Amino acid sequence: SEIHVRISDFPTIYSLRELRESNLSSLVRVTGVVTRRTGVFPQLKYVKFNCLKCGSILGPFFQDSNEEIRISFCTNCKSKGPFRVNGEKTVYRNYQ
User: Which one of Zn ion, another protein, none is in contact with 75 (Cβ closer than 5 to 8 A by kind)?
Assistant: another protein
Of the candidates 55, 45, 54, the one whose C-alpha atom is nearest the C-alpha of residue 87 is 45
Q: For residues 96 and 83, what is the distance between their CA atoms, to the nearest angstrom?
A: 28
Residues that bind another protein (CB under 8 A): 17, 19-21, 24-25, 50, 52-57, 71-73, 75-78, 84, 86
Q: Using an 8 Å Cβ cutoff, are 60 and 46 in contact?
A: yes
Binds 6: which of another protein, Zn ion, none (CB < 5-8 Å by kind): none
Tell me if 52 contacts Zn ion by CB under 5 A: no
